[PDB]
Amino acid sequence: MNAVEIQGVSQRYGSMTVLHDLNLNLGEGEVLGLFGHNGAGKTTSMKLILGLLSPSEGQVKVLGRAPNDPQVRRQLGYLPENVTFYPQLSGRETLRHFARLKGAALTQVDELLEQVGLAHAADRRVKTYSKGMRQRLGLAQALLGEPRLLLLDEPTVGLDPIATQDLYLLIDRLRQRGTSIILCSHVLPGVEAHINRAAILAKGCLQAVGSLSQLRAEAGLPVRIRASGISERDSWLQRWTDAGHSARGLSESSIEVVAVNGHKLVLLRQLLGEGEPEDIEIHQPSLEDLYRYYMERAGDVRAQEGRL
Amino acid sequence: NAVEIQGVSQRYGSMTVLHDLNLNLGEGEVLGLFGHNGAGKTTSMKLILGLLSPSEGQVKVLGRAPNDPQVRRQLGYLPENVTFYPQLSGRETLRHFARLKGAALTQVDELLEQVGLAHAADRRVKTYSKGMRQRLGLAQALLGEPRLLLLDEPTVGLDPIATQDLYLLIDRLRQRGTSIILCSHVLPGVEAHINRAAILAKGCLQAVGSLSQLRAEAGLPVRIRASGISERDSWLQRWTDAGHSARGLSESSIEVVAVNGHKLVLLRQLLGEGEPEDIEIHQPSLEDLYRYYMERAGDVRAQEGRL
Amino acid sequence: NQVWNIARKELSDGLRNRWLLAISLLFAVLAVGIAWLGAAAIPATIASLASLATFLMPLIALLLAYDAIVGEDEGGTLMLLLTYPLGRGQILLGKFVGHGLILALAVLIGFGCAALAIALLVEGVELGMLFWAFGRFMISSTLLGWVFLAFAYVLSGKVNEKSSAAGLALGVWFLFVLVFDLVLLALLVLSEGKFNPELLPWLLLLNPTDIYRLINLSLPVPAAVLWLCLLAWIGVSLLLAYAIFRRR
Amino acid sequence: NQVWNIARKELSDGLRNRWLLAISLLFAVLAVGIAWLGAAASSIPATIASLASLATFLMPLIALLLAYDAIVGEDEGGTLMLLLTYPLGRGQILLGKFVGHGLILALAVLIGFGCAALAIALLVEGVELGMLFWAFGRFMISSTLLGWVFLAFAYVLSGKVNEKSSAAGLALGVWFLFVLVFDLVLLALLVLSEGKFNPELLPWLLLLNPTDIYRLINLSGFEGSGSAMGVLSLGADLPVPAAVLWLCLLAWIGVSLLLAYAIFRRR
Amino acid sequence: QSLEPVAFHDSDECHVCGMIITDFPGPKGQAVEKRGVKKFCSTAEMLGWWLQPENRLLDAKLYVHDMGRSVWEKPDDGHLIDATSAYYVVGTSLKGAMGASLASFAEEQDAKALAGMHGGRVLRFEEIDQALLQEAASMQHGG
Amino acid sequence: APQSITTLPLQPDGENRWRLPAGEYQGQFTIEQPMQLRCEPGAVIQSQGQGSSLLISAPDVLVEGCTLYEWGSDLTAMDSAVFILPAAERAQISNNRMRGPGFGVFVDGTRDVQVIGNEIDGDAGVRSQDRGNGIHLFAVSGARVLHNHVRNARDGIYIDTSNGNHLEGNVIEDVRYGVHYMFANENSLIDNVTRRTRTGYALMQSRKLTVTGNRSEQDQNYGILMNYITYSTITGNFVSDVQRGGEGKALFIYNSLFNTIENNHFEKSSLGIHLTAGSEDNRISGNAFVGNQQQVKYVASRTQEWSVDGRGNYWSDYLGWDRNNDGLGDIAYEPNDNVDRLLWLYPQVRLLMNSPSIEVLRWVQRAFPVIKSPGVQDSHPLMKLPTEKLLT
Numbered sequence A: 001m002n003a004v005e006i007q008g009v010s011q012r013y014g015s016m017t018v019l020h021d022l023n024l025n026l027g028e029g030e031v032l033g034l035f036g037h038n039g040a041g042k043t044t045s046m047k048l049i050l051g052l053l054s055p056s057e058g059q060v061k062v063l064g065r066a067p068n069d070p071q072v073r074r075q076l077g078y079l080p081e082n083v084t085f086y087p088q089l090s091g092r093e094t095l096r097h098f099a100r101l102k103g104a105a106l107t108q109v110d111e112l113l114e115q116v117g118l119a120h121a122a123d124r125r126v127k128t129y130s131k132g133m134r135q136r137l138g139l140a141q142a143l144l145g146e147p148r149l150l151l152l153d154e155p156t157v158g159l160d161p162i163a164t165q166d167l168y169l170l171i172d173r174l175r176q177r178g179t180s181i182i183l184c185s186h187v188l189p190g191v192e193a194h195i196n197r198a199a200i201l202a203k204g205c206l207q208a209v210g211s212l213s214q215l216r217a218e219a220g221l222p223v224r225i226r227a228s229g230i231s232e233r234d235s236w237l238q239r240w241t242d243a244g245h246s247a248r249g250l251s252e253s254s255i256e257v258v259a260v261n262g263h264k265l266v267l268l269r270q271l272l273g274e275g276e277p278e279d280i281e282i283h284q285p286s287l288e289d290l291y292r293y294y295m296e297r298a299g300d301v302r303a304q305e306g307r308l
Numbered sequence B: 001n002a003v004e005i006q007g008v009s010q011r012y013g014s015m016t017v018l019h020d021l022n023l024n025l026g027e028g029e030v031l032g033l034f035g036h037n038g039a040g041k042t043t044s045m046k047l048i049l050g051l052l053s054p055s056e057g058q059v060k061v062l063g064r065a066p067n068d069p070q071v072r073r074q075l076g077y078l079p080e081n082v083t084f085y086p087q088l089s090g091r092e093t094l095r096h097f098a099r100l101k102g103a104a105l106t107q108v109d110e111l112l113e114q115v116g117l118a119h120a121a122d123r124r125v126k127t128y129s130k131g132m133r134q135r136l137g138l139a140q141a142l143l144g145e146p147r148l149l150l151l152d153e154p155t156v157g158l159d160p161i162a163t164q165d166l167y168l169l170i171d172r173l174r175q176r177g178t179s180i181i182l183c184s185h186v187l188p189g190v191e192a193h194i195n196r197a198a199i200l201a202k203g204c205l206q207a208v209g210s211l212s213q214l215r216a217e218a219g220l221p222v223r224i225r226a227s228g229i230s231e232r233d234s235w236l237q238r239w240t241d242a243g244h245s246a247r248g249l250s251e252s253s254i255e256v257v258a259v260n261g262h263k264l265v266l267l268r269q270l271l272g273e274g275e276p277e278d279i280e281i282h283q284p285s286l287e288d289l290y291r292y293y294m295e296r297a298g299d300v301r302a303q304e305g306r307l
Numbered sequence C: 001n002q003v004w005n006i007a008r009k010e011l012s013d014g015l016r017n018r019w020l021l022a023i024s025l026l027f028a029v030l031a032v033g034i035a036w037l038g039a040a041a042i043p044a045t046i047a048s049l050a051s052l053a054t055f056l057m058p059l060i061a062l063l064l065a066y067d068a069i070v071g072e073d074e075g076g077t078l079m080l081l082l083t084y085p086l087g088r089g090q091i092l093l094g095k096f097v098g099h100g101l102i103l104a105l106a107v108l109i110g111f112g113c114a115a116l117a118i119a120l121l122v123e124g125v126e127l128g129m130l131f132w133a134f135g136r137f138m139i140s141s142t143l144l145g146w147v148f149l150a151f152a153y154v155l156s157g158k159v160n161e162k163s164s165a166a167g168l169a170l171g172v173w174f175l176f177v178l179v180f181d182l183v184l185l186a187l188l189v190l191s192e193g194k195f196n197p198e199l200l201p202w203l204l205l206l207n208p209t210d211i212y213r214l215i216n217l218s219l220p221v222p223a224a225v226l227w228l229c230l231l232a233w234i235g236v237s238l239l240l241a242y243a244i245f246r247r248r
Numbered sequence D: 001n002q003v004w005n006i007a008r009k010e011l012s013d014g015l016r017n018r019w020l021l022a023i024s025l026l027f028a029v030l031a032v033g034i035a036w037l038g039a040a041a042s043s044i045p046a047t048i049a050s051l052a053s054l055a056t057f058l059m060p061l062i063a064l065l066l067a068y069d070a071i072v073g074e075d076e077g078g079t080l081m082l083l084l085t086y087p088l089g090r091g092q093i094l095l096g097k098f099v100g101h102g103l104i105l106a107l108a109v110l111i112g113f114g115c116a117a118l119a120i121a122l123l124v125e126g127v128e129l130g131m132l133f134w135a136f137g138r139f140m141i142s143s144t145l146l147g148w149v150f151l152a153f154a155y156v157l158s159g160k161v162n163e164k165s166s167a168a169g170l171a172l173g174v175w176f177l178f179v180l181v182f183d184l185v186l187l188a189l190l191v192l193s194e195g196k197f198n199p200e201l202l203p204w205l206l207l208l209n210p211t212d213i214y215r216l217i218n219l220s221g222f223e224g225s226g227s228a229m230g231v232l233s234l235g236a237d238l239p240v241p242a243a244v245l246w247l248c249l250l251a252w253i254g255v256s257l258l259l260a261y262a263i264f265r266r267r
Numbered sequence E: 001q002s003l004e005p006v007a008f009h010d011s012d013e014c015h016v017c018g019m020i021i022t023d024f025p026g027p028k029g030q031a032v033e034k035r036g037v038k039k040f041c042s043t044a045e046m047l048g049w050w051l052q053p054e055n056r057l058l059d060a061k062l063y064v065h066d067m068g069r070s071v072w073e074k075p076d077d078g079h080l081i082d083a084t085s086a087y088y089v090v091g092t093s094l095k096g097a098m099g100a101s102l103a104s105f106a107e108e109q110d111a112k113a114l115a116g117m118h119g120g121r122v123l124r125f126e127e128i129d130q131a132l133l134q135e136a137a138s139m140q141h142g143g
Numbered sequence F: 001a002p003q004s005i006t007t008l009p010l011q012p013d014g015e016n017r018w019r020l021p022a023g024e025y026q027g028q029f030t031i032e033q034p035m036q037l038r039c040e041p042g043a044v045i046q047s048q049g050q051g052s053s054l055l056i057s058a059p060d061v062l063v064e065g066c067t068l069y070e071w072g073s074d075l076t077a078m079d080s081a082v083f084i085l086p087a088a089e090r091a092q093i094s095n096n097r098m099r100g101p102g103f104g105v106f107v108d109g110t111r112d113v114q115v116i117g118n119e120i121d122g123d124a125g126v127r128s129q130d131r132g133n134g135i136h137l138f139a140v141s142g143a144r145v146l147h148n149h150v151r152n153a154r155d156g157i158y159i160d161t162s163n164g165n166h167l168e169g170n171v172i173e174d175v176r177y178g179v180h181y182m183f184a185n186e187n188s189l190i191d192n193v194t195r196r197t198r199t200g201y202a203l204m205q206s207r208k209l210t211v212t213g214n215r216s217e218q219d220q221n222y223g224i225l226m227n228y229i230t231y232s233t234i235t236g237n238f239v240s241d242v243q244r245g246g247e248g249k250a251l252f253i254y255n256s257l258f259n260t261i262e263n264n265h266f267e268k269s270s271l272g273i274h275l276t277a278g279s280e281d282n283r284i285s286g287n288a289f290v291g292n293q294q295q296v297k298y299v300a301s302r303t304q305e306w307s308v309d310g311r312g313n314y315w316s317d318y319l320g321w322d323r324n325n326d327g328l329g330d331i332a333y334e335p336n337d338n339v340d341r342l343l344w345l346y347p348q349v350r351l352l353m354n355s356p357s358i359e360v361l362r363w364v365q366r367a368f369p370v371i372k373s374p375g376v377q378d379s380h381p382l383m384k385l386p387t388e389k390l391l392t
C-alpha cells in the first residue's frame, strides 16, 4: 500500500515543461522530503498531490484514488508556508471553523489546541499572535480528523528550539500509527534526523530518491573518520595509504582517516577488531553536503569562496 | 575585546527582563545567542546595538560607547524580517544605505555582485522574494567594512545553496577579524559554524562557551544510530532491557543512546554479531544541549506529543 | 451544507471589522439626522434617505468584500481552503451569504433607528404606509448592497495584490455612484438633439444605483421589471465572479 | 549632512507613488479648469476663493497620502529598527522625512498653480501681470504651508499608532475633521444659536483650523462678493493683521512638529 | 407629429394668462410641441413665452394666424402659417388681446399695407426681442 | 318689460323716495326717474328668467335692500341683474341679494357708481364659461365697489379699462378668477378676500395701480397673476396655500417691468414666486417667503438683487446667522442653485434628481463659486418676520 503514487507525470504550463518525468512512490509510514532550489519542481509537485492542479501528461494516485475526491481530502492534512489566518477571528474559533469544513468532531478542537500548546493563547485574536504561534495553529488544522497524509511545507519556521523538536516528536508518534507524511523544508540540517528518504530534485527532473544510507553510498562524498584511543600509533597509522586513503596522522593520541565511503566505515570488524578502539567519534557528511553535490550533478556551477 | 557586556541587569516596568549577564566576546570569535521564553535574546541584542539604555551596568562595544557614531559605522545589523521600500529598486535601496553609513559608492556595485543579486538589481523590491530581501538585507550589513556583524536569523526563507554560501562568507569574515553574533532559532545547522554558544533563558545567562565546553559541563551520552540491521525487534528488546532508550525509525533502522561507558561494549554487538550496513555515532548536539540547559533551570519537559 | 459553515465565519469576521462598524454607526446616525430634519423642519424624507443609502450601501459592500478572494490569497488560506472538501463555487457563494447578511443587518440598524425617529417624531405619520414604504425600502437597499457585494467579488478575483484591489474598488464606487450619472447629465447640457430624450429612461437600467432610486419613487417602464432588473444585476455579476474565481 | 541623505530617498520614493501622481495631476487639471471658467465668465474674486477651496480639499489630501505611513510604515516594515543602528538620531529621521516629503508638496503645487497661471496669462487678454504674479505668488508660498501643516499632522498620527491599517483610519479622520467637519460644526453652531452664542469668541475659532487660516490669507485682497465666503465671513471680525495670519500658520507647523518629535522620541 | 397645427375651440384657455382665447380679436399664436399642444391668447403673449430660456432649446413648431387672408375681429383657424417665416407689423392702433398688437402676415406687402395705414414698421421674427415687446406695449396701452 | 313705477311703492318721504313692501313680483323692471327706492326684507323681485331684471337709466338712484332672483342668461345681449346705463351717473346699489345665471352688476360708461354690501350668488351647474361676471365694470371713472360677497360667478369682479376706483373689503368665493383687471390704469383695491379660486388676482395690462392688503385663501394654481403691469405697488398681500388644480404659484410675475413688491406674505404654496426672464429690475424687498417648497423660480443667468435700501426679505429656509444685532442677516441668500435650474431647463433631469451626483453638485457650488450662475440672490436678508400683523 502506497499513499502517493506519482506515476510518470509531466507538468507543463505553455510550451515550457516545469516538471519533467517525475516518478515517486511514498510508502505507508515513511517521511518523504522534497527539496528544490531552482525550478518549481518542489512547488508544482506539492500542487499535484493536492487537488490544486491537474496532471497534464500523467496521473497521481493519492491514497489509491483521484487527488480531488472528497473522501481523500477528509483524511489529508496540509500546512502551507507563511499562512496568515483571519486576524479578527480567534484562535479557538479558527479551528472550530476548520473542524466544520473537514467534518471532524468538535471534541478534537479542545484537544488539539492543548496538543500543540495553544491553551494559554486560545480565545485571543490571531492578529496578536507571533510567527511561531501561528505555526502551532497551522499545524493544528492539519491534525484535524484522522489524517492519513500530511504535507508540511516549511513546518518549523519561527518556532522555538524546544517546540521544533517536539513537533518532530509529534511526527514520529504519527508515523508509528501509520500516517505517512511529506516534509518540504529549506533548512536541511534539522530535518535530516527525522526524514525517512530524501527526494532531492533539480530544476526539471528528479535527481535522486532514497534513504540517507543510499544517498551517501551512491553519491561519492567524503567522509571524515576521525579516531582517538590509538593502539601503538605507528603501524596502525601508516597502513591507510596503501589501502587507498590519505590519513592525516595526528600525534596527540588521535588518528584521522579520510576515506571514499566504499570502504565504508568500520568495514566488517577491521577498524575495531584490533581490541583497543577507546572512544572513537564519527562525523559523517550531512544532508546539506549531499544537496550541493546533486546541484553540481545537473548544471549549477559552484560559487566562489564567499559570495552568497 | 569586541563586545564587553559587564554586569548588565536591564529592567523596565520594575520587571527585570534581563539579569546579571557577563558576556565578553572575543575579536575573532563567532557567538550564538539562543533564547526561548525570556526576552534576553531580544533585549541584549538591542543593548549591543545601542538603541537601548543599559540600566544598572555598562555595555562597551569595540572598547567604546555603544551609541557613538564612530562605532555605528563599524557595525552591521541584519534584522528579523525587512521588506525595505517596495517602490525603490535594488541599487537605489543599497545606495541609500551607502550614504547613511558613510561608505564609499564603490562598494555598492561590488556588493550586489558579491551577493547574488546583480541579475535582480535595478528591479523593484515588490518583485523580490523573501530570499532576495534576505540577500539584500545582508548587502547592507557588509557595507563599509564592519568590525561587528550582528545577524538576526539570516537564513529564513533562503534556498540551501545560498544558505551554505552565507556561512562560507561568514567564515571569510571571521578570518578577516570581524566578530559575528548569530542570533537564531534554527539551532541544528548553525552549530557547525559558531565558535561559542550562549544559551540564555529566563533572563539569567545559563551557559556560555564552545561546544566542547558545553558537553564538558553537562554529562550527556553519545547517540549511536545504526541502519541496515537484520531485524528491528531483535535488537530493540535488548537495549531497552540494558537501560538505554531506543526507538525505531524505519523498516530496518534504529538509534541507540549510550552512557559513554557502555558505547564500546554495545558497539562490539554491532559488528561481530548481525552485521549492518551503516553506523553513525553522534555527539550531543546543540539541539540536545538546548533542552538540557532549559530543563536544568526553570522549564519542565512536556509530554510525548504535547507541543 | 458547507456553504453555511463558511458563511458563519464571514459573519463573525465581518462583525468584528472596526472599519465596517464605524461606517455602520455613521450610517445610522445620518439616517436619524436626516429623519430629525425631515420631521421637525414621509415621501419627502424617503427620497433624501434614498440618496443617503446610495452613498453608503455601495461603500459598506465594497468595504466588506474587496479583500474577500485576494485577501485570502495574500493570507495564504485560499490555497489551504481549496484542499478541503470544498468547491470553488461554495467558497464564493458562502462568502456571498455571509457578507450578504451583514449589510442585511446594517439596514436593520440603519433604518430600524431611522423609522423609530419617524414613528416617534411626527405624531400622526399614518404608520400603515410606513411599514410598506420602509419594507420596500429595506429590501431594495439590501439588493443594492448585494450588487456591489457581487461587484467586489469580481474585482477581488481579478487582481493579485490587496493594495490594487482597493484601488479598483474605489474606482468601481466612483464610476457606479457619481460618474455614470454625471455623464448622463453631461450629454444633455452639451447638446440637445445629439441624444434622444426618450432613450435616457432605458439607459438608467445600466446602473444599479439608478434602478435603486426608481423603486423608491413609486416612467415608461413598469415597477416589476426594475425588481427583475436589479436581481439580474446580482445574477450576472455573481456568475461573472464565479467565472473569474475558476481562473486563478 | 544626514538630513539631506535621507531626504533624497523620500524625494525618490514619493515620486514613484502612483497614487500621488494621480492626485497631483488632478490638482493640475482642476486648477486649470477653475481658471478657465473664471476666464470665460469675464469673476476675479470668485476664482480666488475657489482655487483656495481646491487646495483645501487636495493639499491636505496629498500631504496625508504621503506621510501617514512615514513612521509606522517603516516600523512594521522592519526598516525603522535597522535605521536607528545607523549613525543617525531620531531628530534627523523625522526632519529628513519632513524635508523630503515637503519638497514634493512644494513641487506638487508649483505644478498646479504654475499651470493655473499659464491658463490665465495666455487666456484672459490684458490681465495685470503684477497682480497675477503677486496673487499666485501668495498662493504658492501658502499652499505649501497648508501642506506642511498636514504633513506634520501625519507624523503625529504615525508615531502614535502601531499598525499601518489603523494609521489610514486616523489620517482619514484628520482629513475629514479639519477640512469639512470643522467648517460644518462652526456653521451649525452659528445656525442653531442664530449668531447669539458669543459675538466675540466665535471669530477666534477660525484660528483653531489651519484650513481656515489658509483661506483667510488668500482672501485678503479679493473679498468681492459676500456669499462666496459663507462661514469665512467672520474673518472681517478678526482684529489680527495679515502678518499674524502667516504666523499662526507657521505656529501650526512648529507645535505639531515638536509634538511629532516628542511622540517619536518615546516610540 | 409636430407638423400639424390643431384648431381652436371656444373652451381653449391661454397657456400664460389662462383666459378664454376666442373672446378676443387679433391673431392667436399656438405652439405644437409633439408631446402636447399649448395655445396662446395673443401673438405677443406667445412671443413673450418663446423668448424665455426654458423654450429656446425646446423643439416645438410655432404657428400664428395669417391676417393677410382673414378679418381681424374673427380669424379663422384655416390658413395658419409658420411663425418663424412671418412678417409681423408693430405699433398699430389695433386692440389685441394681451400684449402689443402684432398682426402676423405672410406676403410682406400686406404687412407693408398695414404699416403705412397705421404708422408702423414691419419686422421679422428674429428681430423680435424682449426689449421690443415691452417697448411696443408701453406705447400702445400707456399715456 | 315693465317699469318700477308699474309696481306699488309706498312713499316714506316726498323727495322721489319710495319703499317697496314685502311680497314677490314678476318680470323685468326699468328705472327711468331718480328714485331712492328702499325695500322691505320680503321684497323678492323675481323675474321669469329672461332679460335684464333691474335696468337703470336715470342718474342719482339709491337702490337699497332689494332681492333679485332668476334673470336672463344671454351674455351677448348682457342679461344682467342690475344694468346701469352710461347716463345713470352716481348710482348706489346697496345691500342686495342676487341669484341668477347672468351678470350680477353690469355697469358701463358710468361715473361714481357705488356697489356696496351686496350678496351675489351666481350659479351651480354652468361650466364657469357662461356664468357671467359678478360685478362687471366697463370703463368707469370714479366707482366705489365696497364690501360685497360674490359667490360662484364667472371671473369675479371683471374690470375693463376703468380708471379710478376702489375695491374695498369684498369676499369672493368659488369662482374662476377672483378679481380680473383689463387695462385699468391708476386703479386701487384694498383688503379683499379671495377663497378657492382658479386664479386669485388677474392683473392684466393695468398700470399705475395699488394692490394692498388682499388675502388669498387656498386658491388654485395662481395666487396673484400679473401680466404687463407697470409702476404698480404690491404692499401687504397675504397669499396662502396655492394648491394645484400650473403647479401652484403664489405670485406669477410676467412682463411686469417697474413695481414695488413689499411686505407680502407668500405661504405654503408649491412655488413662492415665479419671475419670468422679461420681468426684471423691480423693487422686491420685505416679503416673507415662508413654507413654500420652492421659493423663487428664475430661469436666467442675469443677476437680480432683491434688496432695496439694504433691507431684504425673510426666507424660511435661510440658514444664516446675525452677529451684529440688527434685523438683517449676515450672509447673502441665493434661492436657486445651478442644478435647480437644470431641472427647469431640461425636464428629463427629474429622473436624476435624487442621485448622489446631484447632491454632490449642490455641494460643489457651495465650495467652488465659479460655477455658480448669477441668480436671484439678495444681500442682507431679514432674520425675523416683517409681516407680524398679516397672520391674524
Ligand SMILES: [Cu+2]
Pocket (backbone or CB within 6 Å): E017, E019, F180, F181, F182, F202, F204
Ligand atoms: Cu384678462
Ligand SMILES: [Mg+2]
Pocket (backbone or CB within 6 Å): F322, F323, F324, F325, F326, F328, F329, F330
Ligand atoms: Mg449685520
Ligand SMILES: [Zn+2]
Pocket (backbone or CB within 6 Å): E014, E015, E016, E017, E018, E019, E040, E041, E042, E045, E098
Ligand atoms: Zn393668453
